[PDB]
Design a protein around this ligand. Structure first.
Ligand SMILES: Nc1nc2c(ncn2[C@@H]2O[C@@H]3COP(=O)(O)O[C@H]4[C@@H](O)[C@H](n5cnc6c(=O)[nH]c(N)nc65)O[C@@H]4COP(=O)(O)O[C@H]3[C@H]2O)c(=O)[nH]1
Ligand SMILES: Nc1nc2c(ncn2[C@@H]2O[C@@H]3COP(=O)(O)O[C@H]4[C@@H](O)[C@H](n5cnc6c(=O)[nH]c(N)nc65)O[C@@H]4COP(=O)(O)O[C@H]3[C@H]2O)c(=O)[nH]1
Length: 227
């Protein structure tokens, strides 16, 4: 997909459904990117808080992880305050007059939490084991986690054969995964960083694809219920 938003109204309406929803905002600068949240939004500014530092005087790049899809834009630092014995800096930016929304997924990706000890586990070709945490999951694949991948066997379109989804109370399914990307991700003592592996399912049998559909359905049901 592809769509551009200009309306001053849509923009702040969007910056508030995402403040309220406490959704992740990723900021680009130096060389890496930092993930965090909005803390304030008004008629001209939005605020975030990080203990890092950012190139004043320059339109830096932002990106919102929204349920509506990827929302990209560029804004310029306007203010910055310094406080606390534990240094947490307060940056105030300007509202972009231009956004961009991209949503190319024909399947909603369910996000895993504390009550979900989901793992993916296997053995590479060299005979070494891996064990990834599952971060999210859909009918067509999953986004994995690890601090110590073997970057070698995780080449674009490389495939983890005879992997085994360990889905806890749902049991274990044996699948093939196709690696679509490998990325490093950073959150913020606790300044974090792990590798996200983007995976596409390659089903061994067909019941496999159905059993996952039913499972993911049961996760979405406990999602709306429970809380
Ligand atoms: N080739 C490929 N890579 C995947 C796929 N899913 C996840 N990735 C990778 O995993 C990174 C993080 O994905 P995310 O946490 O969902 O965080 C994403 C997501 O929140 C949002 N986004 C991007 N595209 C979409 C989309 O099509 N639909 C939705 N709902 N959000 C999107 O923007 C965030 C950053 O996007 P990226 O910079 O590209 O960084 C992406 C991207 O490199 C996939 O299906 N195919
Ligand atoms: N739960 C989960 N599923 C994954 C992941 N990576 C791939 N998949 C699955 O693999 C399919 C194909 O991914 P793609 O070839 O990169 O083909 C994708 C990709 O080109 C692009 N795309 C989607 N999300 C992202 C993203 O976050 N970042 C970037 N750069 N591209 C994305 O849109 C194409 C269609 O996206 P989908 O319909 O969602 O179809 C996706 C999706 O069903 C993952 O990390 N987690």
């Amino acid at each position: 997909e592809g769509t551009i938003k200009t309306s001053k109204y849509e923009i702040i309406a969007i910056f508030r459904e995402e403040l309220r929803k406490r959704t992740e905002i990723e900021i680009f600068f130096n060389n890496t990117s930092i993930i965090t949240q909005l803390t304030r939004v008004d008629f001209a500014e939005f605020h975030i808080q990080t203990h890092r530092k950012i190139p004043s005087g320059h339109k830096i790049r932002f990106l919102l992880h929204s349920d509506s899809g990827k929302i990209e834009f560029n804004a310029a630092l306007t203010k910055h305050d310094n406080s606390g014995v534990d240094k947490g800096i307060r940056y105030a930016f300007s509202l972009p007059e231009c956004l961009q929304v991209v949503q190319r997924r024909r399947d909603p990706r369910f996000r895993l939490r504390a009550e979900h000890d989901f793992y993916c586990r296997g053995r590479h070709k060299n005979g070494e084991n891996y064990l990834f945490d599952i971060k999210d999951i859909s009918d067509g694949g999953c986004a994995l986690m690890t601090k110590t991948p073997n970057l070698k066997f995780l080449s674009h379109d490389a495939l983890l054969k005879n992997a085994v989804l360990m889905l806890a109370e749902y049991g274990e399914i044996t699948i093939d995964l196709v690696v679509k990307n490998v990325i490093v991700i950073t959150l913020d003592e606790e300044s974090e960083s792990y590798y996200q592996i983007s995976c596409q399912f390659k089903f061994r049998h067909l019941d496999d694809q159905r059993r996952i559909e039913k499972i993911l359905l049961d996760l979405i049901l406990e999602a709306k219920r429970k809380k």
